[PDB]
Design a protein around this ligand. Structure first.
Ligand SMILES: CCCCCCCO[C@H]1O[C@H](CO)[C@@H](F)[C@H](O)[C@@H]1O
Length: 158
């Protein structure tokens, strides 16, 4: 089991970490969602589907900088919604193919009432998402750490 980003940055068997640079909607009004869809950014696969089933969860999702200060978050994992920053490990997603499958994580961020102006700064860390991988074969328990960065400023109109 290993993962890669849309630009080809890989995290090999055993886990590790990688940076993910995301383009964000430049203008987000109070009452609207800023959607950060990681399913177009992070892809994973099973290296031995003939014998092994891989189990994948979002173990933790943490908010940073402007996302932590200016937004009220929700994380959607494989069609179910949870608070973001996270309060528990999600259920598992099964990886049973050698063909790349997107990691089904999306952040839904709505401005808090005090937000206004430059709510997210270009180049800042916005989130850290922990992908946890286990299997039905051995004792492997690996973490694939995704450091999410904003490519641009996000303005919340006043
Ligand atoms: C004849 C025995 C060969 C065993 C191959 C083991 C390959 O291990 C990797 O891929 C597995 C499937 O994706 C993961 F279960 C592991 O955790 C590990 O990532």
């Amino acid at each position: 089991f290993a993962c890669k980003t849309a630009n080809g940055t890989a995290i090999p068997i055993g886990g590790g970490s990688a940076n993910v640079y995301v383009n964000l909607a430049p203008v987000v009004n109070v009452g609207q969602n800023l959607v950060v869809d990681l399913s177009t950014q992070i892809f994973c696969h099973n290296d031995y589907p003939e014998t092994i089933t891989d189990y994948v969860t979002l173990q933790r999702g943490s908010a940073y900088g402007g996302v932590l200060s200016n937004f009220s978050g929700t994380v959607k994992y494989s069609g179910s919604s949870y608070p973001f920053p996270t309060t528990s490990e999600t259920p598992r997603v099964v990886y049973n193919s050698r063909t790349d499958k997107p990691w089904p994580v999306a952040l839904y961020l709505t401005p808090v009432s005090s937000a206004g102006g430059v709510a997210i700064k270009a180049g800042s860390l916005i989130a850290v998402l922990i992908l946890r991988q286990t299997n039905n074969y051995n004792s492997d328990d690996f973490q694939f750490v995704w450091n999410i960065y904003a490519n641009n400023d996000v303005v919340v109109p006043t």
